[PDB]
Ligand binder design. Structure first.
Ligand SMILES: CCNC(=O)[C@H]1CCN(C(=O)c2cncc3sccc23)CCN1Cc1ccc(Br)cc1CC
Ligand SMILES: CCNC(=O)[C@H]1CCN(C(=O)c2cncc3sccc23)CCN1Cc1ccc(Br)cc1CC
Ligand SMILES: [Cl-]
Ligand code: NA
Lengths: 305, 306
């Protein structure tokens, strides 16, 4: 038993991290097959970054301007191009450690593991959710750009995030691996701000189920509610709407625990209205919203990779 | 910016995980060089588990009674020995993925990464602290025995924990890699209970420093305290004593933030008295005690957001 914020094993991704240098800038890249992917902002001086013309800046660069190092081994760049906000450096060597992989774009509320890297070297791993406002609450310092986020299923690494920048409020923004930003952000040093965030309701419900599975049940009650009535409450408390698809996805946990989703919604309604009255749930005094239903089932059933 | 419970990248340890089977029991082992380490309770049946005589159980085993599988490959056992509560199986193949490594026995309050594994296959990685009562609060199911805990400061893997059992209170117990239990526990299914746990005071202080580094000061106050008065108060909230060693270890964080250690102690005293009044610290509504001073320096900026 026990329930912890758990990342995927990172080994398959560690073997893909490289160091990319352009002029005075060093950041991280992802080496898959014979391509290294990194943020296109690698090509910008501090002055360029204020208002970059990436097409014009890139035309002035040749292959030789990009130095790529995998551990102690130099990879020779033999081509370069941009896709959206990602730079693709074709290299002369296919990564022998390339895992089975896909590029996937995730939706708000979904979780993933971040492998924080500096100078091409992995430094730490932790779980994040894509917030409703399309930021992530990561932990990133100067030099972390090009760090990636991923999920695993069986043997296949699904890459979903590449880190581009920190916003003024200390949260993080980036792209999918095809270089499309999550959220209304651009790769320019200009005033940008995350929208007001909301709480991921379906994930809070999942975590309440995790709590029940782990023997923490004080918040259960005799009441139920309707989807409509619950959603009036969610809106009042800055929670995302709960949809029928969310209810369907939670169906397993309902069956296992004997608490229908709308039953658990009545618990959540009461917690929102009344607080915890000095108690905790799974050791938390806040309602946790960065576990998906799948995360709960995975962890509670010991799925391996 | 940001502050998360951050594990070490697990790849160096993943390449060492194997499955060990003895009779009907399968659990995890750690394959380093030509040795596989696992809990000695692998040799016990359910009948054996109350009062196992491990010497008597082991003498009855041959090398070929142990099956070791690394992925799809069977490793041949060519010797075995018991060291304290760990079994060491000598195998005919050195692990080609053996990282630079060492074995370290840690003290209460120290943190490490756990790679939870089942059937020799990794499931996930997360951070744990050795609690003052020598348990850990992990996430471990049936089949997770032999999962390990480790740090990877400076490219070398320091193995510090091997998982042996869950206690009745739902917390976890295990050994160092020399097979010595943390705490008073034994590898027998007899009544044992952990001591009442306490809060790791030095770690709470470290995390308050992390909050200041990351730009938040709301919880500071104009007061100070002596060390002895701090301890008299904090013990009333089930906090561990703060020692001069702890004060010394907090020196770098104190220097980076300009907040004297005993002044941060005065802040903590007031937080214990007052609660948060609806605020959070680094996204938490409780006082976090599973980040060490070293963990904070590892993760945070060296420049305070003033
Ligand atoms: C030389 C030109 N490159 C830059 O300026 C790089 C510098 C490196 N950065 C990091 O390594 C870092 C990452 N993650 C967290 C932190 S906290 C302090 C530093 C970081 C910050 C990102 N900026 C670009 C940038 C900055 C702001 C905005 Br808005 C947009 C953009 C464009 C996407
Ligand atoms: C066949 C004889 N072996 C056993 O019985 C094994 C069975 C496997 N176990 C696990 O895989 C497991 C791990 N971590 C968490 C959980 S939650 C449910 C199960 C687990 C539990 C540990 N016990 C032994 C055991 C049990 C209790 C105590 Br006290 C001491 C001991 C001796 C050290
Ligand atoms: Cl230690
Ligand atoms: Na109910």
């Amino acid at each position: 038993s026990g329930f912890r914020k758990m990342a995927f094993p990172s080994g398959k991704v560690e073997g893909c991290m490289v160091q990319v240098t352009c002029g005075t800038t060093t950041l991280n890249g992802l080496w898959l097959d014979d391509v290294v992917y990194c943020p296109r902002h690698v090509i910008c001086t501090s002055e360029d970054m204020l208002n970059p013309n990436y097409e014009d800046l890139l035309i002035r660069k040749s292959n030789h301007n990009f130095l790529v190092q995998a551990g102690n081994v130099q990879l020779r760049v033999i081509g370069h191009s941009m896709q959206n906000c990602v730079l693709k450096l074709k290299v002369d060597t296919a990564n022998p450690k390339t895992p089975k992989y896909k590029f996937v774009r995730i939706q708000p509320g979904q979780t993933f593991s971040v492998l924080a890297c500096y100078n091409g070297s992995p430094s730490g791993v932790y779980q994040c959710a894509m917030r409703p406002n399309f930021t992530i609450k990561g932990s990133f310092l100067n030099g972390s750009c090009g760090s990636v986020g991923f999920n695993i299923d069986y043997d296949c690494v699904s890459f979903c995030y590449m880190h581009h920048m920190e916003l003024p409020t200390g949260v993080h923004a980036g792209t999918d691996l095809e270089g499309n930003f999550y959220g209304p952000f651009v790769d320019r040093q200009t005033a940008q701000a995350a929208g007001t965030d909301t709480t991921i309701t379906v994930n809070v419900l999942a975590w309440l189920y995790a709590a029940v599975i782990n023997g923490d049940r004080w918040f259960l009650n005799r009441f139920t509610t309707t989807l409509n009535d619950f959603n009036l409450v969610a809106m009042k408390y800055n929670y995302e709407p709960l949809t029928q698809d969310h209810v369907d996805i939670l169906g397993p946990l309902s069956a296992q625990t004997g608490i229908a989703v709308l039953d658990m919604c009545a618990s959540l309604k009461e917690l929102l209205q009344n607080g915890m009255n000095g108690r905790t749930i799974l050791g938390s005094a806040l309602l946790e919203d960065e576990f998906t239903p799948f995360d709960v089932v995975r962890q509670c059933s010991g799925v391996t990779f």
